[PDB]
Amino acid sequence: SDEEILEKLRSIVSVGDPKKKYTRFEKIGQGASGTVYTAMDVATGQEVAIRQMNLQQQPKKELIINEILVMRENKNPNIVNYLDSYLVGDELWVVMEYLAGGSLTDVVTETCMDEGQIAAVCRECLQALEFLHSNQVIHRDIKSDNILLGMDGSVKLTDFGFCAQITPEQSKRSTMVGTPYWMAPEVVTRKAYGPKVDIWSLGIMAIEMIEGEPPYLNENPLRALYLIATNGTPELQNPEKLSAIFRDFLNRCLDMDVEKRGSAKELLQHQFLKIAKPLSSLTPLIAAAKEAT
């Protein structure tokens, strides 16, 4: 009930209006997710990203509550920090840290990453995934768009608007919520999938870093899903150009047999990650992609 949902949010949020705690607001995005502003914590100085939503015009408010509760209880260096929330009437404000380096999508579409840089990003993403999976959380919408970058090269996962919490019981999910092109075959074929759907998505993200886009991007989303389910593991355009260890890493992320696919815990030990360059090696690419926009 809209009423109960408001009381629930009321219990979660900090009290009052945010207009005192933040200053130089600047409007960025303005989709259906709400209006997003950059702003400055007046008390810490930290630049933040604030999403403002009008509840009565927000469809699935349970997902928003789930997102806040999950973020609040699963803080991690490789997850964009959830800072606070406020409710003013039917207006809900969610405050996140702001990363000035844009997203991984900007980097893979505007620059050419080398294997050392790719290994670094893959490692940081696997750190977030191992942590989440160890805490029974499946992100379910892993893709470059949801990987934000700091100017120093920090790599953080965001958007828990589609995550799932599992248990011994209800250890598997069925709900098709992720973005088509990055979805694991088992999500579309068969039912009941587990945490490894995020591992498959990470492999597709690695293809993005190599080729600039996930396989089948050119296709209608409806057709990509059928292809993903009927073609299985994607084929690289120029596999010979990659090192044997990177090809092995991709093969482990994109195996069809879920049992055979690597878990986050297993892949964190992969030798491909050991060739990672320092995270600051990403700064030049992030700068180039930001100006190119």
Curated annotation (Swiss-Prot):
Main location: cytoplasm
Post-translational modification comment from the UniProt entry: Autophosphorylated in trans, meaning that in a dimer, one kinase molecule phosphorylates the other one. Activated by autophosphorylation at Thr-175 in response to a conformation change, triggered by interaction with GTP-bound CDC42 or RAC1. Activated by phosphorylation at Thr-175 by BRSK2 and by PDPK1. Phosphorylated by JAK2 in response to PRL; this increases PAK1 kinase activity.
Phosphothreonine PTM sites in chain numbering: T175
Cofactor: Mg(2+)
Active-site residues per Swiss-Prot or TrEMBL entry: D141 (proton acceptor)
All copies of domain Protein kinase, residue ranges: 22-273
Modified residues (Phosphotyrosine): Y37
Coiled coil regions in record: none
GO BP term, pick one: positive regulation of stress fiber assembly
The protein's name: Serine/threonine-protein kinase PAK 1
Gene: PAK1
Full-sequence range covered: 249 to 541 of 545
